[PDB]
Paper text:
Looking at vertebrate adhesion/growth-regulatory galectins, three types of protein design are known: (i) the non-covalently associated homodimer (proto type), (ii) the heterodimer connected by a linker (tandem-repeat type) and (iii) the trimodular chimera, uniquely represented by [name] ([name]). [name] has a unique architecture among the members of the galectin family. It underlies this lectin’s capacity to interact with diverse types of counterreceptors (glycans and proteins). In contrast to the 2-fold symmetric dimer organization of most proto-type galectins and the bivalent tandem-repeat-type galectins, the trimodular design also accounts for self-aggregation in the presence of multivalent ligands.
At the level of the monomer, the overall folding of the CRD maintains the typical β-sandwich topology of two β-sheets constituted by the antiparallel S1-S6/F1-F5 strands. Lactose binds to the canonical site of each monomer. The monomers of each dimer face each other by the concave surface of the CRDs, while the dimers interact by the side of the β-sandwich opposite to the NT and rotated around 90° respective to each other. The interactions at the monomer-monomer interface in each dimer (A to B and C to D) and at the dimer-dimer interface (AB and CD) are mainly hydrogen bonds. Owing to this kind of structural arrangement a channel-like cavity inside the tetramer is generated. In fact, additional electron density could be observed for regions of the NT in three of the 12 monomers. The obtained data revealed that the region in the terminal section of repeat IX and the beginning of the CRD adopted a β-hairpin structure. The [name] is arranged in a double-stranded anti-parallel β-sheet.
Numbering used by the authors:
A (entry chain E), C (entry chain C), D (entry chain G): 113 to 250
B (entry chain D): 101 to 250
The structure:
Amino acid sequence: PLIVPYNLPLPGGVVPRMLITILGTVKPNANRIALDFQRGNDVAFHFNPRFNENNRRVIVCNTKLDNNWGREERQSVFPFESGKPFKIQVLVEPDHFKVAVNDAHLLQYNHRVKKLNEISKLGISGDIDLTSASYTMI
Amino acid sequence: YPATGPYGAPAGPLIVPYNLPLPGGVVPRMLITILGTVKPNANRIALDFQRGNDVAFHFNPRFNENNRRVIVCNTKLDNNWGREERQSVFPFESGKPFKIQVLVEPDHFKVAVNDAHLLQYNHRVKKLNEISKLGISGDIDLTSASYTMI
Amino acid sequence: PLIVPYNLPLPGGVVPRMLITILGTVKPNANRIALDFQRGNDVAFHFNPRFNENNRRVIVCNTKLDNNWGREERQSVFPFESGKPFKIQVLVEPDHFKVAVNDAHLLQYNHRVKKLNEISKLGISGDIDLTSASYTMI
Amino acid sequence: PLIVPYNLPLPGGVVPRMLITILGTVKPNANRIALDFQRGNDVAFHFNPRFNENNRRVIVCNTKLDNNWGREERQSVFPFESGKPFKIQVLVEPDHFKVAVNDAHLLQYNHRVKKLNEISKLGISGDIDLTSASYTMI
Ligand SMILES: OC[C@H]1O[C@@H](O[C@H]2[C@H](O)[C@@H](O)[C@H](O)O[C@@H]2CO)[C@H](O)[C@@H](O)[C@H]1O
Ligand SMILES: OC[C@H]1O[C@@H](O[C@H]2[C@H](O)[C@@H](O)[C@H](O)O[C@@H]2CO)[C@H](O)[C@@H](O)[C@H]1O
Ligand SMILES: OC[C@H]1O[C@@H](O[C@H]2[C@H](O)[C@@H](O)[C@H](O)O[C@@H]2CO)[C@H](O)[C@@H](O)[C@H]1O
Ligand SMILES: OC[C@H]1O[C@@H](O[C@H]2[C@H](O)[C@@H](O)[C@H](O)O[C@@H]2CO)[C@H](O)[C@@H](O)[C@H]1O
């Protein structure tokens, strides 16, 4: 399959109506998953499901500017399950990313990095086996 | 030691940690003067210029960060510290008087220590008028703390 | 009166069966409150109700060793209301602190700083007017 | 060549007298390089040269425990150049990791993670073209 950590090129950027689809299986005893949309020295959009933060599951979203993480956005909705298949979809709008897991709307993160066109890679890491990493331009 | 009376809210003594009120906030050509003595065995000193829930300008002499002396400047937007600015020139010395001056300019804060210029810090918080207070903490005995326009 | 931020001295430390009681009033439009149990250059126990993190109220607890915050322990129970009087009680046990607000038990925080006898100072700050800070030894 | 980010498996963990060698070339217009010795959910040893942090080059070393970085150790000795090859070496000792660049000793980093045998993985990342990554005992 695809090896983790995995890089999905997005040369010529993210653009509105774009749909990133990530399919795979969560490992057993999973601790974490991360999607990292990168722009140059920054991480425009960090989607980080955490399977155990003091015995809560939480999704944390944020932006890294060079070495500094910004304001954390925390969500408790968490459809992943150890040892189970998943589908993560990221829809790009003008003002925000929208994220769905297992065909159901989960969250939105407003853009902090504005130059969408410069977002050139998606890092996919953590305790997953990856089956596919692809995107749709509608 | 708290001074009550008819001239305003109860006032804290000149003992660390201390808030120096800045009514009107800050404006260019403002000059803050701070006099005191560094305690023996100082670990740290800090100046914290505050606006609402942010620290617009944090000036933080550290006397041992892994056996180096370093001044760290930064900004805190409510719970988040941003890009650190580190400098190595460190005039302070344990058990020694000092004078810190902060001149406000439109582009930046200039900081001078013992009559000689030390560093510049560009404004990340732009609404200078909103900067309400100045925190002064750490391992210093404090002697005076005041502002005047120039 | 008591001026905020206030230092309550605990010379000779914190000791099992000790119960700290802080009375006061939350200011209008409060943003934050903080209790900081200090030890030399460390904060052995920071208890930090925040009135707005991304439109949630959360109590954040942690320990600061010199310049580093450790693992956050987050709790969403939050009895404080803007403009209303409060009571914070902190009971010291051999293995943890217990915290209760307005007579309702809130949480436990396990000691990370083990030398309880060196915890000299309790800092009380944020958007409050303070009426009394005292403790009982039982 | 090999593709960044990359995990060098360290089967049977690290153990004194292990010598890890990494060859590559710094990219033009570098910003960062990172070595991440991993144990479960932690980074035992992060070695992070930075080509421009407020117009200063610096190497930051640290340990990550779940989501928390501890105390930073900053060194200003920096032997890397944009476009230039390099040979990074890491010698494991009982008390610390010793690091050499282009066969000249650079720094030490005391162990914070003590169970060396659980350090299962070394992560290589940043603005480089990784040629090889291998180890051997000495
Ligand atoms: O300590 C290794 C770690 O540092 C993080 O950046 C730090 C930075 O060095 C410090 O100056 C700043 O104030 O705090 C940052 C957040 O911990 C990097 O983000 C991380 O990638 C590591 O390199
Ligand atoms: O953990 C106590 C500590 O939190 C700091 O803010 C954190 C914040 O909770 C976290 O979500 C963010 O990503 O990291 C921040 C920097 O550590 C507060 O700034 C500090 O005052 C304490 O309250
Ligand atoms: O940036 C000023 C701010 O620094 C915090 O400490 C930093 C420290 O300088 C850095 O090396 C480490 O990697 O991250 C720490 C936590 O953000 C202090 O805790 C805080 O008091 C301020 O001084
Ligand atoms: O926010 C994304 C960023 O979080 C870092 O972890 C935070 C942690 O969530 C917070 O509770 C604590 O106070 O500060 C940590 C350091 O910023 C992760 O380490 C990083 O990997 C990202 O996931």
